[PDB]
Amino acid sequence: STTYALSAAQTEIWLAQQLYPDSPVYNIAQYTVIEGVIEPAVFEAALRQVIDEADTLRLQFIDSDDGLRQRIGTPAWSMPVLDLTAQADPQAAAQAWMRADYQQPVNLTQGPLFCYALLKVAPAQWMWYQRYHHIMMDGYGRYLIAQRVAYVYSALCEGTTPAECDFGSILQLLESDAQYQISAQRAQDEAYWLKHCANWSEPATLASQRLRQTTYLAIQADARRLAQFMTAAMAAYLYRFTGEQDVVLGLPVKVRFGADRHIPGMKSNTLPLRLTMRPGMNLSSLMQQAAQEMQSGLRHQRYPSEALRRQLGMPQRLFGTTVNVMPFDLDLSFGGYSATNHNLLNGPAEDLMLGVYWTPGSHQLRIDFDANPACYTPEGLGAHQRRFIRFMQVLAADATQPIDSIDLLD
């Protein structure tokens, strides 16, 4: 049958998993707590329909004489139904079962790349467990699969047939990438990114399993320009703390190649953003420089960052900090009962990841620091978060004030 090549990121994930077969670092996990009753047969039927709809769950990765390939197959899976109403601590028992699952390493060749389970923790409260592998799923695809599961289960439980899928097939992305691999546009993007990152520097970093610290706040001062402001603020903070005038940040971009719908499993492309800190620069100048730099690499955004890393002299990172500004995911409804999503495991740490979560029509922001434990301590991460948030509030208070004259308090 038709086999397809792995992306550079998928190849790196495969190689790192084979080098450390005992590490469950590539496992992505979450659970949906549903306040009500669930019919498990209908849920399994919906799970099976969406598995065939989000066919990235049907992907099989082989290592044949051709090389490391991927193809659409029929994966063998099961949906266990657990009852914890008789346990002394039902929620703790569900947490223990989920932790027993997502802490097991998974063999990529022939082993279940996803695991679906249902856990009854109360007479009117269930827990839908979802575990994937990083080689075929990200966070947004995870939420989209959960949402489609909720919709299809609700449709099947109240008789009506579910409306058509609004996902594209993963093979659309596979064919698009196969054509782009031999494109002249890819050669142009490669040349541009090798010229733009020519020589360069050490990534300005605060580097000194995953460490996660959350802070809530509201500030006196739109998603695109909130991302602009957060990028400029983190770059200025790195410049003020490390003393580096050339700061490189990672900015994930949803690559657009003509796909009408979203394809679960289609990863983002984290592009390096180079920002130069000249003396006497304010937040206005830094934000406009960031906008111009994002515009300069806009037509070249499809070149994968892993290829740019490997095609350079890197054994090992273009950037130490990535900035992710995204709204909160909408809460879900199963049949008619409420359900909230709760994260268990996400992608492994690339040094430091800054997540900025905002809600429409409100001033409140949520700031998440997801750091690599080998280069950050909890106390250091907390001090960095506090200092950065205070410095960012000072920035937002006056966009014309020079960054050099801002007090960096600890």
Residue numbers in the entry: 7 to 214, 222 to 234, 241 to 334, 337 to 431
Passage from the reporting paper:
Nonribosomal peptide synthetases (NRPSs) are multimodular enzymes that catalyze the biosynthesis of diverse peptides with a wide variety of activities. The incorporation of an acyl into peptidyl backbone is usually implemented by a starter condensation (Cs) domain, normally located at the beginning of the initial NRPS module, via the formation of an amide bond to the α-amino group of the first amino acid residue, a process also known as lipoinitiation. Genome mining of two Cs domain-embedded cryptic NRPS biosynthetic gene clusters, rzmA and holA, in the bacterium P. rhizoxinica HKI 454 resulted in the discovery of two distinct types of lipopeptides, cyclic rhizomide A (1) containing an uncommon acetyl chain (C2) and linear holrhizin A (2) harboring a medium octanoyl (C8) chain. Similar to other C domain structures reported previously, RzmA-Cs adopts a “V-shaped” configuration and consists of two subdomains (N- and C-lobes) each representing the chloramphenicol acetyltransferase (CAT) fold.
Despite our successful purification of the dissected Cs domains of both RzmA and HolA, we were able to obtain crystals only for RzmA-Cs, and solved its structure at 2.3 Å in the P1 space group. Interestingly, in each asymmetric unit there are four molecules of RzmA-Cs with two different conformations. The overall structures of the two conformations are quite similar (RMSD = 1.52 Å for Cα), especially when the two lobes are compared separately (RMSD = 0.68 Å and 1.30 Å for Cα of the N- and C-lobes). The major difference comes from the relative positions of the two lobes (i.e., opening angles of the “V” as shown in Fig. 5c). Among a small group of candidate residues, R148 of RzmA (corresponding to A149 of HolA and M165 of CdaPS1) caught our attention. This residue not only sits near the proposed binding pocket for the 2,3-epoxyhexanoyl chain of CDA in the CdaPS1 structure, but also fits well with the simple logic that a longer side-chain of pocket residue would correlate with a shorter substrate chain, and vice versa (i.e., R148 with C2, M165 with C6, and A149 with C8).
